[PDB]
Amino acid sequence: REVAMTDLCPAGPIQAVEIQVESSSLADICRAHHAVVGRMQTMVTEQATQGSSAPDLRVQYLRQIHANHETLLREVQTLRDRLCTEDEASSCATAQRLLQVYRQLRHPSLILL
């Protein structure tokens, strides 16, 4: 479907097409996302060497993205060191929380402009 997004671009929201996927099993999302991302790799490297570049905002929302990624990254690092230390209940809630991070990240992934 088409979704125009004005607080990504400084002037013109290009009417960027969003692609979604919804399913019971997270594994099938993992595979179909793997596929689509590989396919967008192909398309964008095909359009690069021909295509120009539209401008971004540079401000507010790229910093938003940095902050909400950095919190998760330091949390993942603390979790990796805890899994190294091996006190008790080695890895159950650790996996259950990492998949929460994964689902969080998936929902917007690679808004290509």
Partner: protein, 190 residues
């Protein structure tokens, strides 16, 4: 060796689209016993003059999920092989092999089939061994392998497969011893 050189030269050089020899890799659903299964028809095509005579072989190899697992999987991959034997101009062959469920929907999906060919003289007379040409290295991803029964053309009553509620070993284990939809999305410039 003449025919070999003329063919090897024709393939590799002329870095163009339309080649003299081809290995087109498709996917199908066919129905066995009760299960549905994935097939790869690999269709070899000879659009040139040359005729891959004899001592020519075709080495297809079907490579799973690609990552360095600690323990191992019971099958890293498979390879098939076939003598390619007269195979003149315009001629083709068609070689259907399964990828499909390993016993209990057992299908991790990044999967490539890669074709190679193989000349050796050591076949006819020798004298310092043989050759491997690459050919078509196609990957299978999920998006080819999804199937749409509700939308389908016939609109006929096909029974729901409902992939098994448990592993045989898992059911075996439990017997011996006694929620939201996940989402992903992307955006991209119009």
């Amino acid at each position: 060796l003449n025919e070999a050189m003329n063919v090897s030269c024709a393939l590799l050089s002329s870095g163009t689209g339309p080649r003299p020899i081809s290995c087109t890799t498709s996917t199908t659903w066919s129905r066995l016993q009760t299960q549905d299964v994935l097939m790869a028809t690999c269709v070899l095509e000879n659009s040139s003059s040359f005729s891959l005579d004899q001592g020519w072989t075709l080495c297809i190899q079907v490579l799973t999920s690609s990552c360095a697992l600690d323990l191992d999987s019971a099958c890293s991959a498979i390879t098939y092989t076939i003598p390619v034997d007269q195979l003149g101009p315009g001629a083709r062959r068609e070689v259907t092999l399964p990828l499909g469920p390993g016993e209990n929907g057992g299908l991790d999906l990044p999967v490539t089939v890669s074709c190679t060919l193989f000349y050796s003289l050591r076949e006819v007379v020798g004298g310092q061994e043989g050759v491997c040409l690459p050919l078509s290295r196609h990957t299978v991803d999920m998006l080819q392998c999804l199937r749409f029964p509700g939308l389908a053309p016939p609109h006929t009553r096909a029974p729901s497969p409902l992939g098994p509620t448990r592993d045989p070993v898992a059911t075996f284990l439990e017997t011996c011893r006694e929620l939201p939809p996940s989402v992903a999305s992307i955006k991209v410039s119009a």
